[PDB]
Subunit: 304 residues, 6 copies
């Protein structure tokens, strides 16, 4: 009944999921033509099957998005009973408002695209905005790394009981204040005027920077600077989604980060070799369980 | 080509918007039936016209919403060329997300109902979350009162060069900072750690502190923020809200609270609330709205109003 | 699998339904904020469940309609298998045509609204117009009170065998002539020119006024007048939907109605205390059975 | 900007409507293939034009319907600015409800097919049920022949001040009463209690009786109503129908029936049926239709025609 | 669970299907009113049933199309679980492109119509164009007569091993070259300049004309001429869909066709009496099996 | 009213189309983020304008597609009166059918994505299958390079009166014949019977042979067709393609192949490929595209361009 398919060569996360469910990933022929067009074809009958497509990681987002849409379609016109897009890291999630410009609302495009391509359900993790669930008309199950982060903090930061959870920017206030609350410790916040202002006490205490995403690590590196200048004992950076493109990896080592935690919503094995302070939290049991429960009609809200 | 209609009988804002465009409100026979059903009937041809329906400030939100939808539907099947909803205060806006709960995204529902009833355009003001623009597939012009607020501050708060722009919650951070940076002043941020206390970040000592939020309902939060701000060395406290809801004990909570003044736009009618509250000052947003309609209809840039008070 | 939720505090009808099916109504937190906004949240997992929301009665129709739409939505994005709106009394059912004006077709609005909010199916009773079923694209099961009315007439009106079933207005012709037929007795009809014209024989015989709805009872009171003037022995008024707002209750006692039957599609317990000629027909076994059969794939057309 | 096209070759009404607007029918190459498939091909640019397709009275309803849809689809993908269907007689209208049965709502289906094929507007006449306007989400201008009927009565029936306007069924009650009240005359109502008799309510004694229905198909009902009316003391009987279908034995049933006259609009072509039937008189509804198109295109009030024969 | 309904009186094909599945065709009342309107009503409860409507054959295509749409609708608002339109011969399939004119794309109209009327799935045979599957958003299972044709050719044409599969027009190139390939024999092609040009060798060998459709048989008759002129030993004509309207039947006998094969996607029993060279291939086991497999969640792609 | 925007920075075709209409390309801030996400931001009001977005020839199809969609979406919510996609070469066109496989109809998907992102019109050139026009419900103007190709042949191939127009595959038959008939010359057709040989039908002996296909990607097919054609007595071989893709070893395969010349339109930028390939000649299709936009906007017949090179 249930059938798990993967996206790009990124096959690690989808393989870890298929394991926890006692399945083999479905057979698919997936490639690019010489002239850049994505070519996919399902290697088995999916008729009347509850079908999961776990988004791929070969960096190239437009390539990954299209191959996702093509698989979702492939499956829909081949009479799969239901198709869930499993997108730990929601593409274009940061382009969710105009922001006073004549810019597009790209997350609403992507959302539309996933739906018209035929997705019946979405399973994602830590949406850059909670209102992105409102971009769809189909059910979205938005998972949190929150508990997996807390566990780690407690289990890895000796002084956590008197640490400060700091946000990279002004928009992150809500996310850090919740983590500050569950732990019962101080929060603070940074804001690029440039010059970086910090509000809240971080003197003589551990300072964990929490952000949902890192991309160039420009803001997150600087943030760590400023946190030293304001006399934080040590500075950690916890990012649910670790994208680390461009100069990121070298900017990280170069910074004072005691460590930089990520989830494996994005493949990290390559960047680890080039960065020793990186550590991963496995999110495959969280996605596997959300798949098993989405299938069975059992609750998912627990995992939250 | 242009035609403006009001909802209900809270017609002040409607009529001011119409005055400023040189127009009379369109004729509407609108009443509530014995069983609470709303009735509407366009007292005039709207065939091939560019129609605007302005959302009423009566108070009863579900009544008010049904009426808006009904007039939209009324005009569409009457062959209006285009129907715009002018909803200065967006209903169910504070309901834009699931919040770890098994709860509706009421705003996306309302978004949806506005769409199917036949709206082509929306013109709203200071959406509780910008992301609500993504709840539609039609265009949305989301206006800001920021410019007006800045103008109000500059011209009424002597110390505005040395003040502190404050968020009464964690969600409102970008909004304050954005004003802070423009006036080239400091910002502070109040977080409440529920049961049942509030924590302040950012220096407010010996400064004037201005509470800025997008909307104030019962005013339980802001009153407690006026106290915490004073406790932390604030010379005095201002509260500026774009949407003046002031339901339940709000008016009481305000007359008691240590606010120097509470300012609100007229996105929701205040005239009555003022009579019981001498702290309340009112920014007139009909010049913003009218101009937005005027531009919408002509094909002129509305973006001009995002930073520049007409 | 099946789950019944209620609307407003009106909890009597939905409780009667849940009983006949051997269920407890689902847990929900339903209220109004100080500033009039409806706030609902489902108190249990509805994932993969056939979900019934029985419309509420706290008079205020826009309040009741919205809380209905919000529950239908709540349920849809929480991955309920199917959501049926159970609306004995269809809101705005009288606003189903323009009627030569620039008026809205409100029943088509509401219909659209129920569908976009996510209803998969509608179970209703005595639609003010049969063509309101054509306002949807989803299945509608429209139930009749017809048989429950006939039974009552026969069982309560000694002279029924030679009575006359009269209509309040010209539009009711079809509904009364069917009831006149099943019983094999005379029909007649009234029409406000005002002055009220009556066509058809009512001299020396019982005269039962049948209408689908009563609101102020202005037309129905007058109708009874005229029926006396034309020498009806006694005058009954049978209304499937008893709304009785405004002066209705006092207009009723004040009138010669031997009695005024209603169904309990609307709560009547409060108006009964203020009106002794009122009697109710319980429609909960009809709605309960339509729910059980809609669930099971068994026929509903019988109940008709 | 305006362009009018006809369906099939029943082009009288089409051509009269075009004459009255000062236009020639657009060029259409329309034929039926060997296997019964319909072909259409717009013999001219319609790019950015305000197109009207008038529904043909050929007779074969499914043929006729497909053709209408095809021309609509043909014009839409050809970038017509707007496509209006002018369907004087709405197909499958008598199929607007389920009627306690497991039957289709064919009218809502047709409604749906008209929509997806790309119609933006409908202009129809005397919908069997007004509620069919709720089968669309696009605008519908539903025209009445009432005004014309009133005008026909006044000027041809000497006793119209003392007559009785009759419904041949229970469904047609509002329609008669509405005419009754306007002419300030009495109304009667015939109900048939199937097997197999008819029952009359309302005095018709020593009065002229006018049967008014929206459409007459085989005329089995109306003929039996002419007899029952005469039986109940009617001086004489008129039958007025907005849609003259007259299929099967209708023409026979009519020449035999005790009608003084049978009147019908030309919403469906009668010229041929007339030759075999000298009782048939024909109200010309092309001035109504043309005016409705003319207003539609200009942005003028169509409602003017609901009570006032142009 | 499964329920098969038929279209017009054409009841042979649908009866053959219902047999192979061990079912009786569903009860339906289907007629035309005196004024040409199609009147249908389902004679049984279809609630929660997987419903198949096998398109009818009473020649009149607009009549057949509408009665199809009406049945699909009837079923949808009566709460059938799923409705599959079974359309061996897709109506208006030749009107699938503009072709440089301001002509409609009728196959896209019909496709839209089937979908809005409520079809969830389509089972068809030899679509005039494969891209007609792209006219829908619902699954389409397009079956081939290809294998049934090959079998017949091999089993009926002694010299087939050295025969030539010829196409009537230039557009048929793809269809004939595939049949030429599976058999490993020559193909050729004809094209009306009129004067008919033939490309490819047909001298001294059997020449089978393959087309998806025949209508007047004007092109197919002429084609056979030309094939004689170019010295084909014998000429067969294989048409998946045999419509044969107008002068066709007389044009066929009058031509040199050794024989003219068809499928029974259209009723042929009447034209056989008037044409002895006609032979039919039964496609009912192919449609019956596609129905049984579409129901069961078992593969259909095999049949291909 | 009219406004033209380019995608990416492959702005030659865009700029030529704009030059020919007397317009400057609209202002666009378009860049790729660090994580490969595309950004777009319309540097100017498009409110109530008739906008055209021209598809870029960068190369990376999924990048290019996302960008197009994004600009479409960007303009729609910015209240553009109408948004047209001008996609000289339609992405995923060769993916229009299932081909007996469990494969996507990528073209119908792309069709769908173009629709939901908010396109009102498409203007494309030589769709791989005409049937792709049926993947939309909006209008599509599908242009032909046939006229230009005919004009190129007539004026560069001396023997064009005696030549043979060839299809490199079975699918391309109608396309060649259509050119064959117009020039009143013969046609031939190459079929490949995969593993691994090609079979020719139609006399090419002692004639000039012109390979005509709609697109050429790696050129593996056409090179092998140049050889087979020469083998079968062709004086010499021309290859004409409307869409010059030339990826992978194409440029190599071409310099080696016995083509007298390879011709392509500039639907995809060739300037760079030319420098490495002296066989490549380039038909300029911006006069066709501009004219198509010019007509689209005015309401003039585009069909004029289907047979007549402006």
């Amino acid at each position: 009944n249930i059938k798990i398919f993967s996206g790009s060569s990124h096959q690690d996360l989808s393989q870890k999921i298929a394991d926890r469910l006692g399945l083999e990933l479905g057979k698919v022929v997936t490639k690019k033509f010489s002239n850049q067009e994505t070519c996919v074809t399902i290697g088995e009958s999916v008729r009347g099957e509850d079908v999961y497509i776990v988004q791929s990681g070969c960096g190239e987002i437009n390539d990954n998005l299209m191959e996702l849409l093509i698989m979702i379609n492939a499956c829909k016109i081949a009479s799969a009973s239901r198709v869930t897009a499993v997108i730990p890291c929601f593409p274009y999630a940061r382009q969710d408002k105009k922001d006073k410009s004549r810019a597009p609302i790209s997350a609403k495009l992507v959302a539309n695209m996933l739906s018209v391509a035929g997705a019946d359900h979405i399973i994602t993790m830590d949406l850059h905005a909670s209102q992105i669930q409102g971009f769809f008309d189909i059910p979205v199950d938005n998972l949190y790394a929150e508990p997996a982060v807390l566990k780690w903090i407690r289990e890895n930061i000796s002084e956590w009981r008197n640490c400060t959870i700091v946000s990279p920017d002004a928009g992150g206030a809500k996310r850090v204040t919740s983590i500050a609350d569950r732990l019962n410790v101080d929060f603070a916040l940074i804001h690029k005027e440039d010059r970086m202002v910090l509000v809240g006490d971080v003197k003589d205490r551990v300072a964990i920077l929490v952000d949902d995403m890192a991309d160039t690590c420009g803001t997150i590196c600087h943030a760590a600077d400023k946190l030293l200048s304001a006399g934080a004992t040590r500075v950690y950076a916890i990012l649910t989604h670790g994208i680390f493109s461009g100069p990121a990896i070298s900017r990280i080592n170069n910074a004072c980060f005691e460590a930089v935690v990520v989830t494996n919503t994005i493949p990290q094995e390559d960047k680890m070799k080039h960065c020793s302070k990186i550590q991963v939290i496995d999110i495959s049991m969280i996605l596997a369980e959300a798949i098993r429960r989405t299938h069975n009609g059992e609750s998912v809200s627990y995992l939250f």
